[PDB]
């Protein structure tokens, strides 16, 4: 719907932030991928919070 759509991931697991730089997420949460350049991706959750989550708990979500 936009020329540059937002990219999303779905978490496979519950993950609890170990510090305030990481982002706690739940299994099946949908997360905006803000930065996937490293092993820890910066993502944003539905509440607008952002932080880092491990790449390996995330599955890419297909564009509509």
């Amino acid at each position: 719907s936009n020329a540059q759509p937002k990219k999303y991931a779905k978490s496979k697991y519950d993950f609890v932030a170990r510090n305030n730089s990481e982002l706690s997420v739940l299994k099946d949460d949908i997360l905006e991928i803000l930065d996937d350049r490293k092993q820890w991706w910066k993502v944003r959750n539905a509440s607008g919070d952002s932080g880092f989550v491990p790449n390996n708990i995330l599955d890419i979500v297909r564009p509509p």
């Binding site: 510090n19 820890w40 491990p54």
Partner: peptide
């Protein structure tokens, strides 16, 4: 469950 990758974000 998967082991976490090494941290590669910056902290403080």
């Amino acid at each position: 469950p998967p082991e976490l990758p090494s941290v590669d974000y910056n902290s403080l």
